[PDB]
Amino acid sequence: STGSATTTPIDSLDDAYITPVQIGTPAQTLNLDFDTGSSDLWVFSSETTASEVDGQTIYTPSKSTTAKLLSGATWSISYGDGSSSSGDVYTDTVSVGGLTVTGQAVESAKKVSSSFTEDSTIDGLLGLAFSTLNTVSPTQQKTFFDNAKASLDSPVFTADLGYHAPGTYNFGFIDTTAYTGSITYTAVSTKQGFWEWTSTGYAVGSGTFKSTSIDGIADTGTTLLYLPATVVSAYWAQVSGAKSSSSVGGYVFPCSATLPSFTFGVGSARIVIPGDYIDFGPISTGSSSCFGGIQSSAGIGINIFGDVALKAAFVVFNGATTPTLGFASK
Numbered sequence: 001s002t003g004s005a006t007t008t009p010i011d012s013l014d015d016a017y018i019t020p021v022q023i024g025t026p027a028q029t030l031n032l033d034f035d036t037g038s039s040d041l042w043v044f045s046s047e048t049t050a051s052e053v054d055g056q057t058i059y060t061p062s063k064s065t066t067a068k069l070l071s072g073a074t075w076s077i078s079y080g081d082g083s084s085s086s087g088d089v090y091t092d093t094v095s096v097g098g099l100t101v102t103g104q105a106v107e108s109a110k111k112v113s114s115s116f117t118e119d120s121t122i123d124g125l126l127g128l129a130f131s132t133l134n135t136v137s138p139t140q141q142k143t144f145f146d147n148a149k150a151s152l153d154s155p156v157f158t159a160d161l162g163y164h165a166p167g168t169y170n171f172g173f174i175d176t177t178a179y180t181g182s183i184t185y186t187a188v189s190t191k192q193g194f195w196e197w198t199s200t201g202y203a204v205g206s207g208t209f210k211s212t213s214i215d216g217i218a219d220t221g222t223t224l225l226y227l228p229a230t231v232v233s234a235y236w237a238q239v240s241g242a243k244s245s246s247s248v249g250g251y252v253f254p255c256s257a258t259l260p261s262f263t264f265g266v267g268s269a270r271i272v273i274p275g276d277y278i279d280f281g282p283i284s285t286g287s288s289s290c291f292g293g294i295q296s297s298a299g300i301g302i303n304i305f306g307d308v309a310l311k312a313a314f315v316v317f318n319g320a321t322t323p324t325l326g327f328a329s330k
């Protein structure tokens with residue numbers, strides 16, 4: 001089997017992407033944030049504290065003929081941005097882009113933090129990291145990908161995120177029409193539960209490529225590119241008037257600037273992030289200070305190849321016995 005679903009930016013900045021997901025019988029369609037940096041499929045629900053719901057579509061298990069309580073199971077998750085959610089668990093039928101899994105753990109939120117409530121466009125998360133990170137207790141649950149894997153034509157999924165435009169998540173096949181050139185595959189460590197890999201270096205604009213190992217994670221649920229402070233300083237040094245602002249919480253730059261590209265290495269191959277992808281717009285409405293899309297990972301404890309980086313590539317998440325990542329230009 002295969003599946004193919006369109007993913008759509010939630011706003012004009014590409015802050016996140018939402019993908020429609022069918023849950024239950026008859027189908028309830030919720031727009032979920034597919035997150036290769038976490039491993040829980042959780043939704044706003046009929047159980048979510050009413051004051052914490054503001055415009056989201058909810059899953060109502062009592063209206064699904066295939067829902068069953070996973071008795072005694074609870075979940076609770078905290079993300080890198082400080083957000084959190086928790087609740088109980090149902091199993092139900094879940095379909096993505098025509099690919100169906102029966103018996104998927106659907107984590108129903110009883111509580112969500114303010115950042116979730118405030119984002120009316122995201123109805124929950126669908127985790128695509130390794131199932132070792134799933135938070136369900138006392139019986140850890142599998143991701144949608146892990147439950148689908150054995151049925152798929154190939155044990156893979158791909159992320160093809162758009163810049164200010166829709167893109168695609170495919171399951172079970174490579175769309176050879178969706179990228180240019182060849183796919184370069186690179187090793188993955190699953191030791192922290194992430195799609196963790198080592199980039200071979202970077203370049204800023206038309207500058208020379210610096211060969212250096214940068215360990216980090218491929219994380220579709222993170223907006224920005226978080227890299228070591230040395231790398232990030234070298235990038236922003238090429239933008240007149242850019243500075244790190246402790247008050248704003250990262251590098252800012254004059255909205256009048258034209259940003260340089262940023263290249264990262266994948267083995268001997270190179271992915272180029274256009275400068276425009278690194279502009280996250282005014283820090284507050286009407287400001288002439290703009291927020292940068294490349295930020296320091298110092299204090300986060302891991303480098304993160306978030307959407308800024310991934311949307312410059314066609315990315316293969318290869319879930320074979322030995323997982324690997326692939327990157328192609330597009």
Ligand code: NA
Binds near residue numbers: 291
């Ligand atoms: Na921000």
